[PDB]
Amino acid sequence: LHKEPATLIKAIDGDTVKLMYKGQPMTFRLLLVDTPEFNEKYGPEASAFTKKMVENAKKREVEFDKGQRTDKYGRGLAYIYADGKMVNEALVRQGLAKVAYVYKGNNTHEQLLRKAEAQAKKEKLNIWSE
Ligand SMILES: Cc1cn([C@H]2C[C@H](OP(=O)(O)O)[C@@H](COP(=O)(O)O)O2)c(=O)[nH]c1=O
Ligand SMILES: [Ca+2]
């Protein structure tokens, strides 16, 4: 896998962001995670985390996995990095997303995120507090 420049249009919520990819405004969905919907518990916190992480970054990058690059909804499927730190991983590590939607075609960072989730669970953070 290889990283490439991400041109940010706007943050959307915990696990989606709007990028301009090859000159097309495009929703990107974070691979291997699930943040709460904005209206659900930890939803506003997940949204705020992803938003500030991507916005405050000097270097924003997108990394496709080996399989499907878009889902059935036309959304890009990628890992997103902010100054070298993976947003997908940071959400899981902080208890603001569950590892989810694990498809064998696009699962390169599964073990990494499962490691992060086990630590969030141990620490009883956010989603794992109840
Ligand atoms: C993360 C991810 C979601 N999806 C699909 C599965 C869900 O479809 P269904 O709607 O048919 O269940 C939906 C969940 O996205 P959201 O969590 O953004 O709603 O997006 C993929 O197809 N591939 C993926 O990698
Ligand atoms: Ca979601």
- Give the burial string for 35-74 (b: 16+ CB within 10 Å, else e): bbeeeeebbebbbebbbebbeebeebbbbbbeeeeeeeee
How many helices (DSSP H) and strands (DSSP E) are in the chain?
Answer: 3, 9
Residues with a beta carbon under 5 angstroms from ion ligand 2? 15, 34-35
User: Are the C-beta atoms of residues 48 and 36 closer than 8 Å to each other?
Assistant: no
The CA distances from residue 116 to 72, 123, 125, 127, in Å, are 28, 11, 11, 13
Residue 41 CA from chain centroid, whole number:
18
- Residue 81's nearest CA partner among 72, 91, 73, 94 is 91
Strand partners, 64: 78
Two tokens, residue 95: 């208890």
Q: How many domains does the chain have?
A: 1
Question: In whole angstroms, what is the distance from residue 60 CA to residue 87 CA?
Answer: 10
Q: Which domain holds residue 91?
A: 1-130
Task: Tell me the CA–centroid distance for residue 97 and ligand 2, in Å.
Answer: 8
Question: In whole angstroms, what is the distance from residue 29 CA to residue 76 CA?
Answer: 6
Two tokens, residue 78: 């990628």
User: Are the C-beta atoms of residues 129 and 95 closer than 8 Å to each other?
Assistant: yes
Question: In whole angstroms, what is the distance from residue 43 CA to residue 105 CA?
Answer: 28
Question: In whole angstroms, what is the distance from residue 20 CA to residue 57 CA?
Answer: 16
Question: In whole angstroms, what is the distance from residue 107 CA to residue 11 CA?
Answer: 24
Whether 114 is catalytic is no
Whether 75 is catalytic is yes
Question: In whole angstroms, what is the distance from residue 18 CA to residue 23 CA?
Answer: 12
- Residue 57's nearest CA partner among 19, 23, 103 is 19
φ/ψ of 123, rounded to 5, equals -80, -5
Cα angle 107, 85, 116; round to 5 = 55
